[PDB]
Design an enzyme around this catalytic site. Structure first.
Site, PDB file in Angstrom:
ATOM      1  N   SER A 171      -5.956   2.933   3.982  1.00 33.03           N
ATOM      2  CA  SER A 171      -5.401   1.898   3.120  1.00 33.03           C
ATOM      3  C   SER A 171      -6.491   1.117   2.370  1.00 33.03           C
ATOM      4  O   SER A 171      -6.374  -0.085   2.148  1.00 33.03           O
ATOM      5  CB  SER A 171      -4.494   0.972   3.934  1.00 33.03           C
ATOM      6  OG  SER A 171      -3.269   0.819   3.269  1.00 33.03           O
ATOM      7  N   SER A 209       0.787  -1.246   0.000  1.00 29.40           N
ATOM      8  CA  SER A 209       0.000   0.000   0.000  1.00 29.40           C
ATOM      9  C   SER A 209       0.818   1.296   0.000  1.00 29.40           C
ATOM     10  O   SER A 209       0.252   2.377  -0.158  1.00 29.40           O
ATOM     11  CB  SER A 209      -0.992   0.027   1.167  1.00 29.40           C
ATOM     12  OG  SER A 209      -2.067  -0.864   0.916  1.00 29.40           O
TER      13      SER A 209
END
Ligand SMILES: [Cl-]
Length: 261
Positions: free
Chosen positions: A103, A43
């Site tokens: 995220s 991420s």
């Protein structure tokens, strides 16, 4: 050096491979450990995607306020914000905030789509002088983190330089830089990572990542007192596909670095 010895011992204790890059903006000096080895970004690549959309917005003024439909087909494996808006809309600003601060993997794929595919994110990286970054896939398969696989990787040195350019340099326009910094400072996913190893009085903005092979990452911009801002990136990955992520290894790496400041 003491930092290198400590990072190597941490690496041994953890059973994994650790990469660290620290840039001190006072004198542009760098402290590196595996600075030029590739690591899976997971991420952490969301920062590049959000930044690329911000860059688009410099000439497409209201882009950030454009509504984007969230459909069931868009949902992937981790959608904390997007799932609340399925069959409704979110703006690109809201998608950027979801990607960065939660995220959200659906939000990332919406940004990738806004940029014309993974190649659009990589093209932005090149446009800001990052020749190392590569995004090859969409969520969630960009998280496979296979040892030796160069897909969806960067190096600690490269990502520290890029984060510095985006948050403290002129890669983005002034309003856009401020917006990225605001989003990073509001992150909800990083309390156990770099943040846990820094003095509490030092303000930071960060973006974490995690994936297969117990991959555990964090990239941060830090404003200490008594000196110029710093950029710190910590990348970590393990030999076993099913290893659990270790946010505490990143906190420990941050402590080691803070000891050497
Ligand atoms: Cl990967």
């Amino acid at each position: 050096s003491a930092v290198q010895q400590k990072l190597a011992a941490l690496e041994k204790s953890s059973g994994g491979r650790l990469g660290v890059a620290l840039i001190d903006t006072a004198d542009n000096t760098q402290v590196l450990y595996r600075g030029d080895e590739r690591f899976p970004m997971c991420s952490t690549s969301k920062v590049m995607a959000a930044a690329a959309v911000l860059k688009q917005s410099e000439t497409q003024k209201q882009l950030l306020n454009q509504p984007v439909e969230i459909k069931p087909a868009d949902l992937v494996n981790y959608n904390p914000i997007a799932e609340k808006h399925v069959n409704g809309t979110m703006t690109l600003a809201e998608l950027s905030a979801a990607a960065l601060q939660y995220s959200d993997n659906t939000a990332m794929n919406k940004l990738i789509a806004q940029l014309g595919g993974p190649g659009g994110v990589t093209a932005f990286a090149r446009a800001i002088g990052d020749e190392t970054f590569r995004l090859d896939r969409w969520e969630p398969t960009l998280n496979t983190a296979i040892p030796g696989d160069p897909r969806d990787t960067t190096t600690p040195r490269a990502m520290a330089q890029t984060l510095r350019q985006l948050t403290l340099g002129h890669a983005l326009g002034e309003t856009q830089r401020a917006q990225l910094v605001t989003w990073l400072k509001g992150n909800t996913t990083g309390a156990a990572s770099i943040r846990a190893g820094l003095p509490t009085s030092w303000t930071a903005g960060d973006k974490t990542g995690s994936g297969d092979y117990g991959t555990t990452n964090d990239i941060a911009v830090i404003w200490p007192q008594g000196r110029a801002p710093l950029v710190l990136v910590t990348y970590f990955t393990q030999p076993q596909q099913n290893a659990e992520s270790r946010r505490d290894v990143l906190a420990s790496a941050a402590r080691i670095i803070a000891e050497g400041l």
